[PDB]
Design a protein around this ligand. Structure first.
Ligand SMILES: *CCc1ccc2ccc(OC)cc2c1
Ligand SMILES: [Mg+2]
Ligand SMILES: [Zn+2]
Lengths: 1412, 87, 212
RNA sequence: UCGAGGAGGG
DNA sequence: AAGTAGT
DNA sequence: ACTACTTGCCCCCTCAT
């Protein structure tokens, strides 16, 4: 804290290494000889032997006798201990042994030379650690230190190499000792540490630099400890819980152990030394030095304190969630924080936070005294710390700090410029507000303080959704920035209105919720009319009101305003919304849809689809059009008019809202009756062996799959029966229609019927023997036995329904609990794996190594928040409707621009050069239609893109009062060249070379296809009716909003991608039946070697879509089967006459297939099973015969003989040869199909595909699904489409088709995991993750085995997992840390090179005088 | 090296000011204004140092240069006066 | 039965002509779409049995391939009739390679090249030899949906790539040398491949990977 | 003022 | 225990 | 094929050096 004249710098590089004993003895300030910590007279001095002998203070006296500084300074000074004998460093016994196996003993020389080939190529590995792995692999088995070697010129006359003669021992680890054997019996000698030390000290400098070591920073000899550093007290501080008692740290005691064992070894060495007696006091010194650094050694007793609990090792301090790195550096407890219960408030602005007075009196901001505030600050100092607008402390330039609670001068402080005043938090201070867990960045947002009473944080309700905050008792956190520039970082980056439209889903993340949403529908109703007395209150309630009472829609006998009318006062001007819900006409008979013009509602009931977090909703529009702050006011003004109107209209929900209304119940139970009658039918079916299974499914499985569909297909029927019976006044229906709470299934279960309970997919199992409850007879598969709840929640469950429903509920609660640890840990692995990824100032997306992950972020360079789903109007419809819309033929009197559309209309008829222009326009639009159908194969047209051109043109049509009568003053040169010119101004990259310029046309290609598709000449002139005015204005706006939509270099895209994936992973209430989201995502992120549902989707040859027989042929062509699948039984007979036969049913078919063994093997096959696989006994026998060739004489009955028999005999004394031949036949040999393929189902997928007319048509095709993967083999099968085949095993895709195709399948799978739960995540996040996993050439797991073994800095990698082992290898290998990783600058307390740190701020002296 | 400075007539980054550049400029300035540093605008009654910095930026009277570093130590200097400020 | 096996060999012959055409050698599209009948019409004996040594062929570089890569030598593609390639046919093909003095030699083996023969694979530098299994060649993987356009960059094209992005080769995405497509292009170490794939954010996106 | 164990909250 | 990296 | 492994958000009482 005190001033120092040393130059202040920041850490640029961290150079890791190992301590030479000499350097320890050098920087050692004390010798440390006695375990006595205290003066031994307990005179409150510290002995000149262990604690403060020049090492630092534990008291309040100018100590640190070397520093003369006293604590809060003198960080701690080191001492040394000279060890009586070398001991291993426990963290390197693995590496020491590994080095011991590479070098010869008694000759410090590398075992393998450059005279070896595999060595000299492993020697050239540029990496250090991987080279050491290859050298240790080549040298762990050369055991003879060879002295001469076959040369490179001639293996005959060979070459010497100055080699050791001795044989190299085979070494093994025993506890903490290294023991070896040599070369008629062996010999075993333990390797003394000094022997290894002398051998390491003789390793050549080139050899250990080849072994990854560093001549100056980490020689191999230093993994062995000779002089041991003694950390100062601040690392192992004392305790003062009484006065004449002081508790020393665990480390101080463990050192005293090391010192005791050392003095024992020193006297035993200096005296008469019995060999065994000292060579086990050494084993004890090694034990103490080892367990002092790591006391969690595998396969050893822990070093235990007196009380039995183990001594906390130093490694234990750094490792783990609560260790040094995770819980003290990557995360801290912080000052200037506050936390309390949260509440809602209809009367706070969206970006305000209600702060209780007691907290505002406590939290304090340091304001520098400037002439702009000396008056206000002087008044706050007068109010002092007890009244709210007051202050706690005053800091003078000297430093010593005045406490207004106590200072006698707190009354008459006359402030001075430059002094700091620590004033209370006051209204409109930017503060950071957070609810936990903090899953995405919107969980922490900057609010404006409003000091209020009553001890609760108060939130605006539209901000609940991003925090995931309810008011069932939550607490939220508040952090108060302390610098004038961290406030700016909050108000200009993290402020709530900025975070409204989120880049995670390119949609808003805040909407109109709960009361205001339920009321805005009742208010918006067509027959909702407001009287004058109440209109004036609703108007005065909107603060930005212009004071202009709008003309009432109804004058007539009495003036009446509509609900839509008054609500429109909150919608600002310049807002245009169109949405056709369903059967919506422009007449909107059902008040369906939404039509807002200039900020006035024209028709349509307002609900969730208009004012929720909807994609094209009112909030997304106002935010893009008018701005963050205008949309934030839009929340407050709607939540004030709707909330006020609802306050006086009222709203409730009673139990009568669940009444089924008489006969609807009668008709509901009839519906359940005829359903309970259909299952009893299928039961008598399956009980009489009359039902038949679908392929690859049990008769029983097929039965239950039927029954379940029968049941909950009838539950949904009673559901819609009650939804339809419920009048439009039913308050629950009102909430479902407004979209504020509740859904269909809710009405169904509450009023009609609950439905079938399920556990693990199937119905309620037979927990007891052959029944679900003892109140049931055995083998009872009835609906009301396996857990079908027939009663509504209104009627009431029976004890059986109650218990089954309890079982089903417990499955969901278990699922939640069992999965939260998984989703939370997947979230962490994602963040820690993408954390150092951001966009640099060349638009390339890089990590902390400069390695390019994405050349242009998201392949388009756009901020996901500036992107909306618009339609590509040039991909669908007939080839003709295309021509009708876009073709302009100036040389044809029927297909020319009508002279009504523009003024040069008649004088351009027959213009050959203009037609040459419109021709090349039309050839570009048809080129685009080609390109689009190549990119989007299935014809999907709606795709998220940067500039909403539809709104940008509706704006022009309104701004300029465009009448669909007057002809445009545009010329075709204006439109065609204006758009052609506009494109080369849509800029993302900006380099002056063909690489970057090609990258530009690439990144801009798709958007330009949309632009030309919407600014085509006939569209501009016949649909839009634009003017050269409105058109030029549309072009300038498109260029503006485009440049605004590019990403800003600095966006921490990595963390955004991780949070954008991990947070939807939280909301997954999971679980062909394949592995579902949360487990499958665990599979994918881990690069799971043996996944759970390895399906294979095989599409067949093009000219065979509907050929079902062809599909049946491929099913039989690939689906594996063995003889076991068709064999009923096998028997061994003694039938010793190869020409006669004792079994009379085999009397025939013996003179028909007309030396050997008298022993007969007779198989009986299943006619039904043979027919599922098309029989052909000849194929079976022919395969067996060609399986054994001459050794096995085989005959069989013919393909329709009543019993299906194969007889087998051996050819020219054990007879167990036949016993083993039986299961050789049953298990090993195959009949037809591919290996690892098991079931093969035929499903008939729908598939959109373009008609010869042009438009896309549903043309479904037969597809085979699969249980098991053999891609390399199924691929080469005749009759299939080998270019549409797909596997959910992307590990296989990477191995057969390449890394790129693996990246595409890896994305297709992660996308299926999110979409399967209804969620939407924008492309660039999933894309960025998949690109990180594939950028190194293979599949890098998001796992301590994959990415955390990269070349990123050691501090970054250690901040994840395997912390101390990573820091040990960093020390041994002398790693260098760029401190480019964000985690490094977090550890070092430096501004990280992210966001506002991606650049430096320079002051310019010449502009400093230009301005004065 | 110091051939690390891309010359002005060869700068290829964006001519627009980023969210982070603007936030770091307004913060840095409001910090210096708050530490009694010379102000280059008519205050016109403004007394919050941030609102003062927003006024300096509105008139391009901020005398600071943004040093944009490229992934190799190369960098481009840009004055706040040059940089376009949409938002 | 024996007839269905010869079709697979014909499919691999096709995929070989496609791979040679793609690597940058003068092959026509007629030679590629060599129909089903005309194959047994040329490479089957009296019994209708495929003779494989007849199938081997040389291929020369195209005009623009020599313009882009001047040292793209001539390529030789020998097939083997014996399903296990003995070291005798290897040294025959190998001394053939340096005798006629080629740059690249592609050896398609039916079932197994012995550990003895594959010892002579890097025995003729400065020429390289690639070994392809017959069954991994029946389907051209590059015709798959998920395999986008790979393009081998020249030494100057890559030097320009590293300059215009300020990159060391370590900062470039990597393609494994044993990667199926890298084997398909004869992609050697350090050679940079340029990957043009379609996109849904933009119309088309260009990435690059480097060998190993 | 040292920590460990248990019970709870969203 | 899961699951993988390494002996 | 067997063994060596690491590792699974924020926020009161009781006990005993
Ligand atoms: C602390 C991380 C976290 C929060 C909420 C979650 C909700 C459900 C699940 O399991 C399905 C995971 C969560 C993880
Ligand atoms: Mg809650
Ligand atoms: Zn000191």
């Amino acid at each position: 804290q005190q001033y120092s004249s040393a130059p202040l710098r920041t850490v640029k590089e961290v150079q890791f290494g190992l301590f030479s004993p000499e350097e320890v003895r050098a920087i050692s300030v004390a010798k440390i000889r006695f375990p006595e910590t205290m003066d031994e007279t307990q005179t409150r001095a510290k002995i000149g032997g262990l604690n403060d002998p020049r090492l630092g203070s534990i008291d309040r006296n100018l100590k640190c006798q070397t520093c003369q500084e006293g604590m809060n300074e003198c960080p701690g000074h080191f001492g040394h201990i000279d060890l009586a004998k070398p001991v291993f460093h426990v963290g390197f016994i693995a590496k020491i042994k590994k080095v011991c196996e590479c070098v010869c003993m008694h000759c410090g020389k590398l075992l393998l030379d450059e005279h070896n080939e595999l060595m000299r190529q492993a020697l050239a590995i540029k990496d250090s650690k991987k080279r050491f792995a290859a050298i240790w692999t080549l040298c762990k088995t050369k055991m003879v230190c060879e002295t001469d070697v076959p040369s490179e010129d001639d293996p005959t006359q060979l070459v010497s190499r100055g080699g050791c003669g001795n044989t190299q021992p085979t070494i093994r680890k025993d506890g903490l000792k290294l023991v070896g054997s040599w070369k008629d019996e062996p010999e075993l000698r333990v390797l003394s540490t000094e022997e290894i030390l002398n051998i390491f000290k003789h390793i050549s400098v080139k050899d250990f630099t080849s072994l990854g070591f560093n001549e100056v920073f980490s020689r191999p000899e230093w993994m062995i400890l000779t002089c041991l550093p003694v950390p100062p007290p601040p690392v192992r501080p004392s305790i003062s819980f009484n006065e004449s008692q002081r508790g020393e740290d665990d480390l101080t005691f463990k050192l005293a152990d090391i010192l005791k064992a050392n003095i024992s070894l020193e006297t035993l060495e200096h005296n008469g030394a019995p060999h065994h007696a000292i060579e086990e006091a050494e084993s004890l010194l090694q034990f103490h030095v080892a367990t002092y650094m790591d006391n969690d050694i595998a396969g050893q007793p822990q070093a235990l304190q007196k009380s039995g609990r183990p001594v906390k090792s130093i490694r234990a301090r750094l490792k783990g969630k609560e260790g040094r790195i995770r819980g003290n550096l990557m995360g801290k407890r912080v000052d200037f924080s506050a936390r309390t219960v949260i509440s809602g408030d209809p009367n706070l602005e969206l970006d305000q936070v209600g702060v209780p007075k007691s907290i505002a009196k406590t939290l304090t901001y340091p304001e520098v005294v400037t002439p702009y505030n000396i008056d206000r600050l002087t008044q706050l100092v007068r109010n002092g710390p007890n009244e709210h607008p007051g202050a706690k402390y005053v800091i003078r330039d000297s430093g010593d700090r005045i406490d207004l609670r106590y200072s006698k001068r707190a009354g008459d402080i006359q402030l001075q410029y430059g002094w700091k005043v620590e004033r209370h938090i006051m209204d409109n201070d930017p503060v950071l507000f957070n609810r936990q867990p903090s899953l995405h960045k919107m969980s922490m947002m900057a609010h404006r303080v409003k000091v209020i009473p009553y001890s609760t944080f108060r939130l605006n309700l539209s901000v609940t959704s991003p925090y995931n905050a309810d008011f069932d008792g939550d607490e939220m956190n508040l952090h108060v920035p302390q610098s004038e520039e961290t406030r700016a970082e909050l108000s200009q980056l993290c402020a709530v209105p900025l975070q409204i439209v989120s880049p995670q889903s390119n949609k808003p993340c805040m909407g109109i919720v709960q009361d205001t949403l339920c009321g805005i529908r009742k208010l918006t109703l067509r027959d909702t009319f407001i009287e004058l007395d109440q209109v004036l209150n609703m108007l005065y309630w909107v603060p930005d009101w212009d004071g202009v009472i709008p003309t009432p829609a109804i004058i007539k006998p009495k003036p009446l305003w509509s609900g839509k009318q008054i609500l429109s006062v909150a919608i600002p001007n310049g807002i245009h919304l169109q949405r056709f819900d369903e059967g919506t006409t422009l007449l909107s008979p059902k008040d369906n849809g939404m039509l807002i013009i200039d900020g006035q509602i024209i028709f349509g009931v307002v609900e969730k689809k208009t004012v929720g977090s909807s994609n094209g909703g009112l909030i997304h529009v106002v935010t893009r059009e008018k701005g963050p702050q205008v949309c934030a006011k839009l929340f407050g003004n709607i939540q004030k008019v709707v909330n006020f109107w609802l306050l006086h209209n009222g709203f409730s929900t009673g139990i009568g809202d669940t009444i089924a209304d008489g006969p609807t119940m009668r008709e509901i139970t009839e519906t359940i009756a005829e359903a309970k009658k259909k299952v009893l039918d299928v039961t008598k079916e399956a009980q009489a062996n009359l039902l038949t299974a679908k392929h690859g499914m049990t008769l029983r499985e097929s039965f239950e799959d039927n029954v379940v569909r029968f049941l909950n297909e009838a539950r949904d029927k009673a559901g819609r029966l009650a939804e339809v019976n419920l009048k439009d006044l039913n308050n629950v229906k009102q909430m479902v229609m407004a979209g504020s709470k509740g859904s269909f299934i809710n009405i169904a279960q509450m009023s009609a019927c609950v439905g079938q309970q399920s556990v693990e997919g199937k119905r309620i199992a037979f927990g007891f023997v052959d029944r679900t409850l003892p109140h049931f007879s055995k083998d009872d598969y009835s609906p009301e036995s396996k857990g079908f709840v027939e009663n509504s929640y209104l009627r009431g469950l029976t004890p059986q329904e109650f218990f089954f429903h309890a079982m089903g509920g417990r499955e969901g609660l278990i699922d939640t609990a069992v999965k939260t640890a998984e989703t939370g840990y997947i979230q962490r692995r994602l963040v820690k794996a993408l954390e150092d990824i951001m966009v640099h100032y060349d638009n390339t997306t890089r990590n902390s190594l400069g390695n390019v992950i994405q050349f242009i972020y998201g392949e388009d360079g756009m901020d996901a928040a500036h992107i909306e789903k618009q339609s590509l109007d040039t991909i669908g419809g007939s080839d003709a409707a295309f021509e009708k819309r876009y073709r302009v033929d100036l040389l044809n009197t029927d297909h020319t621009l009508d002279p009504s559309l523009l003024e040069s209309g008649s004088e351009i008829l027959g213009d050959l050069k203009l037609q040459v222009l419109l021709d090349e326009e039309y050839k570009q639009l048809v080129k685009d239609r080609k390109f689009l159908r190549e990119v989007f194969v299935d014809g999907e047209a709606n795709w998220p893109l940067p500039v909403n051109i539809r709104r940008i043109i509706q704006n022009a049509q309104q701004t300029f009062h465009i009448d669909h009568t007057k002809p445009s003053d545009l010329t075709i040169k204006d439109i065609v060249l204006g758009v052609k010119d506009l494109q080369e101004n849509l800029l993302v990259l900006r380099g002056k070379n063909e690489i970057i310029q090609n990258a530009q046309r690439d990144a801009v290609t798709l958007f330009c296809c949309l632009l030309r598709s919407r600014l085509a000449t006939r569209r501009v002139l016949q649909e839009y009716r634009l003017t050269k005015q409105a058109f030029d204005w549309v072009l300038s706006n498109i260029e503006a909003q485009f440049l605004r939509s590019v990403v800003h270099p600095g966006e921490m895209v990595g963390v955004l991608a991780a949070q954008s994936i991990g947070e939807p992973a939280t909301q997954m209430t999971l679980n062909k039946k394949v592995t579902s989201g949360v487990p499958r995502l665990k599979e994918i992120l881990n690069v799971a070697k043996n996944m759970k549902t390895p399906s294979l989707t095989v599409y067949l040859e093009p000219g065979h879509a509907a050929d079902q027989e062809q599909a049946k042929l491929i099913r039989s062509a690939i689906e594996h089967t063995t003889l076991k699948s068709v064999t009923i039984a096998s028997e061994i007979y003694y039938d010793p006459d190869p020409r006669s036969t004792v079994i009379p049913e085999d009397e025939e078919i013996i003179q028909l297939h007309f030396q050997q063994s008298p022993w007969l093997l007779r198989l009986e096959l299943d006619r039904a099973a043979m027919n599922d696989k098309d029989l052909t006994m000849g194929q079976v026998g022919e395969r067996i015969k060609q399986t054994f060739k001459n050794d096995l004489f085989v005959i069989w009955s013919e393909d329709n003989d009543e019993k299906l028999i194969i007889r087998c005999r051996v050819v020219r004394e054990e007879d167990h040869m036949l016993k083993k031949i039986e299961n050789t036949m049953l298990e090993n040999i195959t009949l037809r199909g591919v290996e690892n393929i098991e079931r093969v189902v035929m499903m008939k997928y729908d598939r959109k595909v373009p008609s010869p007319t042009g438009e896309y048509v549903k043309e479904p095709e037969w597809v085979l699904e699969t249980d098991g993967v053999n891609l390399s083999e199924v691929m080469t099968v005749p009759g299939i489409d080998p270019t549409r085949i797909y596997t959910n095993s992307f590990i296989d895709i990477m191995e057969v088709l390449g890394i790129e195709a693996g990246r595409a399948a890896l994305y297709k799978e992660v996308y299926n995991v999110i979409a399967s739960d209804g969620s939407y995540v924008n492309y660039r996040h999933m894309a960025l993750l998949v690109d990180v996993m594939t950028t190194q050439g293979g599949l890098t797991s998001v796992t301590r085995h994959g990415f955390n073994r990269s070349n990123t800095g050691a501090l970054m990698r250690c901040s994840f997992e395997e912390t101390v082992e990573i820091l040990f290898e960093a020390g041994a290998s002398a790693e260098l840390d760029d401190c480019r990783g964000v985690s490094e600058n977090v550890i070092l307390g430096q501004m990280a090179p992210i966001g506002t740190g991606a650049f430096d701020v320079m002051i310019d002296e010449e502009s400093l005088v230009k301005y004065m | 090296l110091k051939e690390k400075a891309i010359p002005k007539d060869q700068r290829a980054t964006t001519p627009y000011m980023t969210k982070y550049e603007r936030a770091r400029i307004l913060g840095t300035r409001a910090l210096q204004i708050s530490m009694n540093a010379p102000v280059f605008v008519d205050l016109e009654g403004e007394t919050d140092p941030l609102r003062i910095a927003m006024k300096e930026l509105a008139e391009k009277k901020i005398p600071l240069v943004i040093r944009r570093y490229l992934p190799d130590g190369s960098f481009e200097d840009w004055s706040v006066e040059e940089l376009i400020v949409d938002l | 039965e024996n007839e269905r096996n010869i079709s697979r060999l014909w499919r691999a012959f096709r995929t070989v002509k496609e791979m040679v055409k793609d690597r940058g050698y003068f092959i026509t599209q007629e030679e590629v779409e060599l129909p089903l009948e005309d194959f047994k019409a040329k490479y089957c004996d009296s019994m209708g049995r495929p003779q494989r040594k007849m199938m081997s062929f040389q291929a020369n570089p195209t005009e623009e391939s020599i313009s882009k890569f001047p040292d793209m030598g001539s390529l030789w593609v020998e097939f083997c009739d014996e399903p296990s390639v003995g070291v005798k046919t290897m040294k025959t093909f190998v001394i053939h390679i340096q005798e006629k003095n080629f740059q690249t030699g592609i050896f398609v083996y039916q079932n197994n090249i012995t550990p003895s023969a594959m010892k002579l694979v890097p025995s003729i530098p400065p020429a390289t030899i690639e070994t392809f299994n017959e069954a991994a060649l029946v389907v051209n993987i590059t015709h798959h949906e998920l395999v986008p356009k790979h393009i081998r960059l020249s030494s100057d094209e890559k030097r320009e790539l590293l300059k215009r992005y300020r990159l060391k080769e370590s900062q470039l995405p990597r393609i494994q040398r044993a990667d199926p497509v890298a084997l398909y292009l004869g992609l050697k170490r350090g050679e940079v491949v340029k990957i043009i794939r379609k996109s849904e954010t933009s119309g088309r996106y260009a990435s690059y990977r480097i060998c190993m």
